[PDB]
Scaffold this active site. Structure first.
Site, short mmCIF file in Angstrom:
data_model
loop_
_atom_site.label_atom_id
_atom_site.label_comp_id
_atom_site.label_asym_id
_atom_site.label_seq_id
_atom_site.Cartn_x
_atom_site.Cartn_y
_atom_site.Cartn_z
N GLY A 166 0.80 -1.22 0.00
CA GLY A 166 0.00 0.00 0.00
C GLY A 166 0.83 1.27 0.00
O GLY A 166 2.06 1.24 -0.16
N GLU A 167 0.13 2.39 0.18
CA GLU A 167 0.75 3.71 0.18
C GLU A 167 -0.15 4.74 0.87
O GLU A 167 -1.37 4.71 0.72
CB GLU A 167 1.00 4.12 -1.26
CG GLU A 167 2.02 5.25 -1.39
CD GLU A 167 2.41 5.42 -2.84
OE1 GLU A 167 3.49 6.01 -3.12
OE2 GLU A 167 1.61 4.95 -3.68
N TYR A 203 2.35 9.63 3.41
CA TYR A 203 3.62 9.31 4.06
C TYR A 203 4.61 8.64 3.11
O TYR A 203 5.82 8.89 3.17
CB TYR A 203 3.31 8.44 5.28
CG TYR A 203 2.31 7.31 5.08
CD1 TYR A 203 2.72 6.09 4.54
CD2 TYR A 203 0.97 7.43 5.47
CE1 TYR A 203 1.83 5.04 4.38
CE2 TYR A 203 0.08 6.38 5.32
CZ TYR A 203 0.50 5.18 4.77
OH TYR A 203 -0.36 4.11 4.59
N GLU A 213 3.51 -4.89 13.31
CA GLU A 213 3.05 -6.25 13.12
C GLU A 213 2.29 -6.32 11.80
O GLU A 213 1.58 -5.42 11.45
CB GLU A 213 2.13 -6.62 14.28
CG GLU A 213 0.84 -5.80 14.29
CD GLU A 213 -0.20 -6.31 15.27
OE1 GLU A 213 -0.40 -7.55 15.39
OE2 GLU A 213 -0.86 -5.44 15.85
N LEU A 217 -0.66 -7.37 9.42
CA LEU A 217 -2.03 -7.83 9.27
C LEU A 217 -2.41 -7.87 7.80
O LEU A 217 -2.11 -6.91 7.06
CB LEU A 217 -2.94 -6.91 10.07
CG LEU A 217 -2.87 -7.12 11.59
CD1 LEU A 217 -2.25 -5.92 12.26
CD2 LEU A 217 -4.25 -7.39 12.12
N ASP A 232 -9.67 9.41 12.36
CA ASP A 232 -9.82 8.95 10.99
C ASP A 232 -10.26 7.49 10.97
O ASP A 232 -9.75 6.71 10.16
CB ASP A 232 -8.53 9.13 10.18
CG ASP A 232 -8.73 9.19 8.68
OD1 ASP A 232 -9.89 9.37 8.24
OD2 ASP A 232 -7.75 9.03 7.94
N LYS A 253 -12.19 4.60 9.78
CA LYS A 253 -12.88 4.22 8.57
C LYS A 253 -12.39 2.83 8.24
O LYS A 253 -11.34 2.43 8.71
CB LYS A 253 -12.58 5.19 7.43
CG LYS A 253 -11.11 5.35 7.08
CD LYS A 253 -10.91 6.22 5.84
CE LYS A 253 -9.49 6.60 5.59
NZ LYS A 253 -9.42 7.49 4.43
N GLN A 277 -10.93 1.33 5.74
CA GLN A 277 -9.60 1.27 5.14
C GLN A 277 -8.52 1.25 6.24
O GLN A 277 -7.45 0.72 6.01
CB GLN A 277 -9.39 2.44 4.18
CG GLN A 277 -10.28 2.48 2.93
CD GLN A 277 -11.74 2.91 3.13
OE1 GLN A 277 -12.17 3.41 4.17
NE2 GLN A 277 -12.56 2.66 2.12
C1 LIG Z 1 -4.11 1.18 6.98
O1 LIG Z 1 -2.88 0.52 6.78
C2 LIG Z 1 -2.14 1.02 5.69
C3 LIG Z 1 -0.69 0.94 6.08
N1 LIG Z 1 -0.42 -0.19 6.99
C4 LIG Z 1 0.09 0.04 8.24
C5 LIG Z 1 0.37 -0.98 9.07
C6 LIG Z 1 0.09 -2.28 8.64
BR1 LIG Z 1 0.39 -3.75 9.79
C7 LIG Z 1 -0.43 -2.57 7.40
C8 LIG Z 1 -0.72 -1.51 6.51
O2 LIG Z 1 -1.23 -1.67 5.39
#
Ligand SMILES: COCCn1ccc(Br)cc1=O
Ligand SMILES: COCCn1ccc(Br)cc1=O
Ligand SMILES: COCCn1ccc(Br)cc1=O
Ligand SMILES: COCCn1ccc(Br)cc1=O
Lengths: 301, 262
Positions: free
Chosen positions: A15-16, A19, A85, A87, A131, A133, A135
């Protein structure tokens, strides 16, 4: 923080954010799978971002099973890596993959119960999330769900003072922020969890507005236009307008038809207009809706 | 109402009480500091008071900054020529933590009369972050004060402002105030303010909340009372000037009581 990038093996991008990118990685010595969030400081002109200062400082204090765990911070001169960690998925992705069956009620109930536990822990440690939500809610293979992304979070004092306005992603934003109130508090996070509760049942956003005023109007058409009786003070709020259309409150049975009486009770208390009457995460844990709650694994891979 | 978080205020107070002992500086760091003195620190804090008023920073930000500085100087030996650099980086970090609109780094470089470069300020930012290990959510005098204020019957804005003022005075003087926790200075300040304005005393209800009595607050009280009496003569005056303002109900102009009967 005992870490050093050399013991991590990148696996894939996951993801992104504003940041930067997040990678899934593996600790080559222990086996542990982690999420690495990179923050760029070479490409930073104002030094370390305030967002990252809050995320790191606040997450260091919040050790709870329903809050994503920051394991480490690798703090080179060039770069800053937040080690979390791992997930596997977020709740928005899981809802989209539960498309034509729905999420089973035991799982909605387990997820909502965990989210309230996590949020109460935040509020007990003077942290607003701001925030919440789908996501930003992460699920594992074991049935856990955890609050994540604390870059918009803030350490509050009691009583609260004026903080940043127009926080919270719009669909999940509380009426008191929308009306420009001078102060907001823990109740804004409950509002978001209310929207999420409803969204877990329907698999669609409850108030998907396209603008501040459209968001308000969508809320008002569901919950009725608030007056001084339901919400003392509202007509004095900075962005309250007397010309607001005055929509009747609809029966909650129609807001989320498949929800049982206890569910409707709890949802209604999460979405109370008056922040002072809105239920706390602490009190919500005792709601009869949770009488039969279990922690089953997610039904999908 | 929810702005006073009825359902979490106790948990929060308990938690701040644990955190103030963790974020507490070493009471005797100045003796182990070769080129810096209580007096130099007083000059720096007084300056940060002025910086805060020029940029209209929250008082909480000022308090955080002092917390960061004192913790930093607890483990890091600093030459007098760099004391201000520490302070500037501390104030930058506090501003980013606490302010809606922090001043830009260039503004921090500007207030140091170009004593330091932007690169120095940024590098020090990182160093302070490393030394404190990002533990920036420190309890302040103010976080306790605002809770104590909820016990006023009724609320007096002169009491509140005077308490804030006294708490700020304590930041200036590491001797004696390094030896007292934020929760205790706040209590002393609140009682002194209340006594001065209304003649009343530390209430039963805050005995219940805090476990502190006038007995346990007495040492700090005796110090804060002397600080209040001597405040017009102190070498540093930025706080008195600041609290002449109407924003703060002109409380620096109130006369201290001659005795506490305590
Ligand atoms: C909402 O999470 C987006 C960025 N992020 C942050 C921590 C972890 Br663990 C997984 C991940 O994807
Ligand atoms: C094993 O390689 C160490 C260096 N490293 C490792 C992972 C990530 Br994500 C970025 C990076 O630079
Ligand atoms: C009933 O009042 C309409 C109020 N309104 C409508 C549109 C926009 Br953009 C702002 C706003 O305040
Ligand atoms: C207010 O006291 C005057 C002495 N002084 C003044 C400015 C700076 Br920067 C350092 C210092 O020591």
């Amino acid at each position: 923080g005992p870490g050093s990038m050399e013991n991590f093996q990148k696996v894939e991008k996951i993801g992104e954010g504003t940041y930067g990118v997040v990678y899934k990685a593996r600790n080559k010595l222990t086996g542990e799978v982690v999420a690495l969030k990179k923050i760029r400081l070479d490409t930073e002109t104002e030094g370390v971002p305030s967002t990252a200062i809050r995320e790191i400082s606040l997450l260091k204090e919040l050790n709870h099973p329903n809050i994503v765990k920051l394991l480490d911070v690798i703090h080179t001169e060039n770069k800053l890596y937040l080690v979390f960690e791992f997930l596997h998925q977020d709740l928005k992705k899981f809802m989209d993959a539960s498309a034509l069956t729905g999420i089973p009620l035991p799982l909605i109930k387990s997820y909502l119960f965990q989210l309230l536990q996590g949020l109460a822990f935040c509020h007990s440690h003077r942290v607003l999330h701001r925030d919440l939500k789908p996501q930003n809610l992460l699920i594992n293979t074991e049935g856990a769900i955890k609050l994540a992304d604390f870059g918009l979070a803030r350490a509050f004092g009691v009583p609260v003072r004026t903080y940043t306005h127009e926080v919270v992603t719009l669909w999940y934003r509380a009426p008191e922020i929308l009306l420009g109130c001078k102060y907001y508090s823990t109740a804004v996070d409950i509002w978001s969890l209310g929207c999420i509760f409803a969204e877990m049942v329907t698999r669609r956003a409850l108030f998907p507005g396209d603008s501040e005023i459209d968001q308000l109007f969508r809320i008002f058409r569901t919950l009725g236009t608030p007056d001084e009786v339901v919400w003392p003070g509202v007509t004095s709020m900075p962005d309250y307008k007397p010309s607001f259309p005055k929509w009747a409150r609809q029966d909650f049975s129609k807001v989320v038809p498949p929800l049982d009486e206890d569910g409707r009770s709890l949802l209604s208390q999460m979405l109370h207009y008056d922040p002072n009457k809105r239920i706390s995460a602490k009190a919500a844990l005792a709601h009869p809706f949770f009488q039969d709650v279990t922690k089953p694994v997610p039904h999908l891979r | 109402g929810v702005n006073e978080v009825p359902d979490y205020h106790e948990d929060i107070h308990t938690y701040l009480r644990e955190m103030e002992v963790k974020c507490k500086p070493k009471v005797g760091y100045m003796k182990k500091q070769p080129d810096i003195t209580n007096s130099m620190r007083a000059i720096l804090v007084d300056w940060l008071v002025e910086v805060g008023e020029e940029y209209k920073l929250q008082n909480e930000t000022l308090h955080l900054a002092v917390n960061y500085i004192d913790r930093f100087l607890s483990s890091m030996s600093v030459l007098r020529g760099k004391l201000q650099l520490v302070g500037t980086a501390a104030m930058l970090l506090a501003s980013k933590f606490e302010e809606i609109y922090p001043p830009e780094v260039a503004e921090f470089v500007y207030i140091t009369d170009d004593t330091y470069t932007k690169k120095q300020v940024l590098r020090m930012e990182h160093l302070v972050l490393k030394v404190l290990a990002f533990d920036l959510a420190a309890p302040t005098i103010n976080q306790f004060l605002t809770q104590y204020f909820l016990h006023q019957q009724p609320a007096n804005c002169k009491v509140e402002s005077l308490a804030m003022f006294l708490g700020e005075l304590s930041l200036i003087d590491a001797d004696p105030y390094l030896k007292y926790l934020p929760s205790v200075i706040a209590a002393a300040a609140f009682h002194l303010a209340l006594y001065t304005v209304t003649g009343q005393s530390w209430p039963e209800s805050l005995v219940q909340k805090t476990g502190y009595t006038l007995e346990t607050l007495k040492p700090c009280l005796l110090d804060l009372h002397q600080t209040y009496l001597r405040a017009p003569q102190h070498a540093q005056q930025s706080i008195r000037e600041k609290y002449k303002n109407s924003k703060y109900h002109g409380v620096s102009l109130l006369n201290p009581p001659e005795t506490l009967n305590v």
